[model samples]
Target: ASAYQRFEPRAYLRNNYAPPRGDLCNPNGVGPWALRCLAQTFATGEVSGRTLIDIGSGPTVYQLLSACSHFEDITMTDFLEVNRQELGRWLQEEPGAFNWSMYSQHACLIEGKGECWQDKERQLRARVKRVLPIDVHQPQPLGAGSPAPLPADALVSAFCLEAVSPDLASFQRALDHITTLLRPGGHLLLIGALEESWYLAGEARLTVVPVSEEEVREALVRSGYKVRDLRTYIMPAHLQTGVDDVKGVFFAWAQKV
Candidate 1:
């Protein structure tokens, strides 16, 4: 038997994953806050590309909202069929889709890049070309049926590999798999949980590979990446809320060079 069973996407979505609401993008939360910094970095120069794949996207777009303008193409990937469905519903702008206009607005206000939340929403919706299945365990994470994207210019993985992998080795292999999708010298934006063993995803309890901040940096270096920037955000006491013992969150930017 496998060391750890994979999490159920439906259950994950039902319990833990909320849509882009509340102070989700608040720089204080670290995830969205880190995104602001990345957007600024990308915005500083013409740091752009043909594709930005959201690896292990898992029914979320808050992370990608700030990055939509940086890439000409945006592709979302997930390990579960249900997550793909969840993303598809939002992409199709279905009646009950998860709304992310607030995140869009908040990001723009922070960066002062542009306004018009509707424009942001429409651009992101239009730029996205695919929502496909990907197994991080595989060398080629994207499945056979997935359209030929070759290697992407960038990959922004938010709280993915650790949540699914059974152990640190598996996590490292998953990172290797994800890096294969990035071109040489391409950029990778990683947002991850720090020192978390388990987290509540809806009602079912799920196992998460425990990882420390130092380990995160070491793994990136071992994977042949240059750590451009690393910022750790301590979890707010009120936000701990018994969901998980996430000591903190780390937002990092690295280069495949």
Candidate 2:
């Protein structure tokens, strides 16, 4: 199927078979699953005052919305024009909905419930500032060597790398561009599917080439980042139906030093 025909943003987001909320998604109670994973990485005290560059950011707006509370700034990058437009609409309509407090309560259950919750909310709100557009595949304003609107502290990509370029070599080049935007010793957080087959996007079915944790580690290492930690979880069968069908997502944390 043609690339455009394969991945339809509106359809994918509306599809009940997608991840997170899918019946087989993360029913094992992994704590809001993806948001919790991102929070754990940010809470490591490595992300404060740092700008987060979200590669291949889609219409979900969940990552940028969640990061707004934890980081200095956020830049959403995507190759698809429709994704950009939809993200922009979200930014304008409901910016606070993505804040940490809302996401934490709804997406995952935190440990301490009362004052701790309020404090966490205040802290995350102070960090997040912007949600601009970027397309990592091209040499745009936020491209490598360009004047970054904000100092990049970390790179957070969700379900992105696999969809870009042709092969591993091309993927590395794209990663190199992202690394260049970050300062030395910055962090990289990646969350995406593993060994995914294909999913329907409207009338067309798109095939997702499988990506493994080992490959992710090797790719990050080759791109000049040190692999700090790697973890893989089996997505519940209920969440794994359709495009969401698969073992689960693989999350990796790396550093730029």
Candidate 3:
């Protein structure tokens, strides 16, 4: 089995995994707080009408769905087949699943309460017209070697890279792949765990190498991405109980130069 396969079944089932409504990790189901941090950076006038590629997107398509209003197209990629299947099912059964009110809540956290922010979301939804499967570790029809069937103007990744890669080198490769998919000057948004060791997805216990702000910045810079803006939000010490103390997870925003 591929290293990622161990996570596929459990992750597929855990895709429905919802933490407490206000639990820092759960944050309105799709880790809303983190997504808000990522979205805010991308919302800075550069994201509209651009294409965004979501790497290692799981069942929670909330971020991409939220980005739809700003970007013209969205390409979601995952290493596991189960995740791909789940995404396909969501597309066929509820193409408008991404249009729900939760997106507004996320937007509110970023731009504050306002009609202009609401209008921006509507505009984004109209532009998001497609969702294609992509895998950063390997080449697919829409991958780097392809004819840009799913070309992106920006890239967003959440709680994904750390799970798929065991070390920084491999993680850097994945980041490089994301950069390759974007046009020059595109943006990359990342919302993920920091110092998190591992977690349970049903019966599977997936191990994730904890990442530090310094490491993330270094990796992005080495991968040919410019650190336009970067910030780390603490998830509080209580949330880190049972889990190792890694200073909580963080949200980072960078641009491909």
Candidate 4:
């Protein structure tokens, strides 16, 4: 937690999500690729449920833009107070919140729902019932804490587990910890950096445990998940902005069995 104390949300956002890395014009860019992956996955119509919980959201709304319409009660959580506050600024429509318009626009285009991006943002803000703190390293991620709904129907996590863990063992343990919050047969949509050892955020340079595609699959299976769909995106030379040493990104749709 000492390292994360210096995590500057705005700096982290700018480094990884701004400009060259998050260019929307490039369909193959990491940002667009993630939005497309999630949008298409939700379009399949198999992952819907009454409640949805996002684990370690990290001040990100893009991960939930496509999923807002699928569930009525949505909960967003993160380990850092700054991250939670950053998300709150957007949720509350505060004056200086970071603009997520481009992300919402792209999600609308891919979903083909015919709704304007404004409606998408409004819907998400309305659906999200709470932004609570989460410690995925604990057996009960939400902790014996908030009264937020438990046993969520589905879970969405992006770049959370490996980013917080020291090694693969802790990564798998974190996965197992969050797994307890989902009901049996519930779906877990996970996204993470592949072979990334470290990343920068303001004055903090956090270490990440790099895991291969096969290792990720093995972790899921060991955690009692039935792998539904797993996709990988190799980092292109142009997209490697050096914010992180990510060789690739992996998106996995796993069901708790």
Candidate 5:
């Protein structure tokens, strides 16, 4: 596949997510590299949380591909119910769905346990226990009558907060909202666009908090987190198409103090 070609996850979100015309990452793109780094981190000291949470998981499972083996129970969440249903469709093995086996292959390979992509996907499905709704703006994300999700072992969020938040204040508020859910000593795996202000998703243009490294670090501190490691990757030219001039992607693994 050409680096510029539209990918499968776009369709996965077509019904619930951004437009096909918007910018989307490639399966063989930045996520795999970031996952490989996470695998290395896990290899040093694995996720100790009994439950793992993927915050704002937009109709995709790649974020959990590497972490699935670390937690006994995994909780997947998204602000959009449609995205949650999209994830369910894949988990249930519905016909004509997005093939996550490809992601499994990459993630497992990164873990140096690459063998059967089917087995990886199966393991991930089994690990996932909940696909609940989330609202970062709300004090209770799961909503009333819904079981609260927080104080988990760890959390993963990829390209979510920036897409939804308008400015740094709201961005930090959402970050604190997620922080409330994480228990003391729990881990947070975070990723997002760096030096970006807005992105075009299909037809709608979304704003990204133009956060700097110092700002991100300060927010973690204010939220009671200790940064274990932080890494940044400059966006390649081939992946740049003018929809979102995201200069780079930032990845960090921080532990709550």
Candidate 6:
């Protein structure tokens, strides 16, 4: 069995997103940086569409907090059942679900739409129309008979492709596979770890295909995407808490060519 079969949601959350590294209160932290990146990218208003699909959402909601306002229908997917269940628990407001209020509130503040955190959460919950399984390695990510619409107007992914892929070739193939879901001229908002080799989520010490900024740009172009805006964030010395050797993070806004 794959190491990912041993994935644990709560443990994963605590490992990557707890205290020092995941602190949303720190303006320089990764969480806030990601929100700021998305907020700034989405604020351009060129990213809006009727349908938005989150490719491999994992167990986190923070990635979509800024995107909730730009799309009418949001579909989240994950390769693992546990991750999907974790996402479902939050979306359905089940008891003991991981709290994401801080992320939501920060998104609200950064977006500056004058809405409260509660409203942002409510809006995100409402906009999220479906939670489905996805295998990015497949030609049809949502499967051949997916109930959700195909050729989505936009796609968003964070720390997913490289984390699951075994190597660069598979990573490129996964990108191509997911690209089939988007319409021509539609946009893809991608965020990934830079020079990251491994990360622990409970017993699952997953391998990551460490990618450089230039490689990411090259992969997008090879996959038929026109690069729009690509930004990188170096891991602060204080925030490098050792859960992973992620040298930095990259955020890219690319359009299908």
Query: Against the true structure, whose lDDT is highest?
Result: 4
| Runs of candidate 2 exceeding 4 Å displacement | 16-31, 94-104, 111-133, 139-141, 144-147, 203-205
Candidate 3 lDDT over 151-244, as tens digits, reads 5677778878777677777778877766776777777788777776665554456777788889988988898877877776776544443423
Instruction: Candidate 3: list runs displaced more than 4 Å.
Output: 1-3, 8-17, 21-32, 93-131, 139-151, 241-247
Displacement of the residue 67 alpha carbon in candidate 1, Å: 1.0
Task: Summing lDDT over every window of 10 consecutive residues in candidate 4, give the lowest-scoring window.
Answer: 140-149
**Could you give the C-alpha RMSD of every candidate to the true structure, in order shown?**
2.8, 4.3, 4.4, 0.9, 5.7, 1.0
Question: What are the lDDT scores of the predictions, listed in order?
Answer: 0.77, 0.61, 0.62, 0.92, 0.73, 0.91
Over 4 Å off in model 6, which ranges? none
From the highest TM-score down, the ranking of the candidates is 4, 6, 1, 5, 2, 3
The residue-by-residue lDDT of candidate 4 on 1-257, one tens digit each, is 57988889999889877888877887878888899989988999999998999999997889999999999999999999999999999999998798999889989998897999999999999999999998998888897866678889999999999999999999999999999999999999999999999988999889999999999999999999999999999999887777789899999999998
Please provide the root mean square deviation of candidate 1 (C-alpha atoms, Å).
2.8
Tens-digit lDDT string for candidate 1 (1-257): 13223545555544444432145644566446655766666776645688888988987787787788888788888776767887888889987676667677776776676677788878889989988788888887886656837688888998898888879889888898888888988988898889988887554576889998788998888887899888888877766667678888888788898
TM-score of each: 0.89, 0.77, 0.76, 0.98, 0.86, 0.98
**lDDT for residue 92 in candidate 3, whole number 0-100:** 53
Model 6 per-residue lDDT tens digits across residues 1-257: 28889989999899777777778887888888889999999999999889999999889999999899989889999989999999989999999889988788889999998989999999999999999999998888899888677789999999999998878999999999999999999999999999999998888899889999999999999999999999999998887777889999999999998
Q: Candidate 1, residue 70: CA error in Å?
A: 1.4
Q: Comparing 5 and 6 by lDDT, which wins?
A: 6
lDDT of 2 by residue, 1-257 (tens): 25643566677666632335532233354336666666677656666555677777765655543455556656666666766666665455454322224443543343322434445544444443444556555534365553344457777887766655455676667777777777788888877777665555566565555677787789899889898878887766555445545566788888887
Model 1: ten consecutive residues of lowest lDDT: 13-22
Model 3: worst 10 consecutive residues (lDDT sum): 15-24
Ranking by lDDT: 4, 6, 1, 5, 3, 2
